[PDB]
């Protein structure tokens, strides 16, 4: 559908921001686990990958339709801890706040596009 193509980029950006938000909050929650590595995703490359499948064929009514079913990069440690935990509070707190801001911005842009498509139709 053409409607999907217009809203594909912002939807994928919003979903990627939510996933990275979950990853950052997981990094915050597991700050005290000894031996836990701080993981993160490269937002731009994954957004390229998602932006850049074959529903199985249903011959009749009984035939069952096809059933549907990111890469994590390690953060470079800054300070060496003794328990092997590489999670840094300041870095991930700033990243968490930034991801929240960008999620809000994506919501704003997507809502503006939908509202414009709506006022085009209203009449």
């Amino acid at each position: 559908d053409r409607l999907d193509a217009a809203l594909r980029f912002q939807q994928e950006a919003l979903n990627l921001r939510a996933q990275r938000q979950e990853i950052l909050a997981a990094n915050i929650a597991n700050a005290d686990t000894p031996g836990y590595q701080a993981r993160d995703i490269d937002f731009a490359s994954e957004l390229k990958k998602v932006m850049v499948g074959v529903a199985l064929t249903l011959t009749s009514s009984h035939h069952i339709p096809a059933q549907a079913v990111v890469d994590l990069l390690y953060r470079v440690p800054d300070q060496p801890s003794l328990d092997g935990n590489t999670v840094d509070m300041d870095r991930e707190r700033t990243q968490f706040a930034d991801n929240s801001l960008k999620y809000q911005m994506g919501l704003t842009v997507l809502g503006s596009q939908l509202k414009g498509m709506m006022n085009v139709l209203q009449g």
Partner: protein
Amino acid sequence: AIQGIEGVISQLQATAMAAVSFAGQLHAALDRISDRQAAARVQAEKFTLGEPGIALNDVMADMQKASVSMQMGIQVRNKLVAAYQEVMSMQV
């Protein structure tokens, strides 16, 4: 076409011897509005991409301007349709 180029040279001869419109204006306005909207969208996608130099201020202001231009186009279309309906209602 070969005959099409014949017609072009014929019109050139016509110009030699001899020696924009409302639909065009509406098409120009639609193209301008669409170009502004596409520019704002492209800048927004570039900002969401993480590329340096693109400020959130400019993105938000350009989205605002694009929304205003879209609303202007919608109002012009509404009136134009109303005027056409009024003219077609005339009894001859």
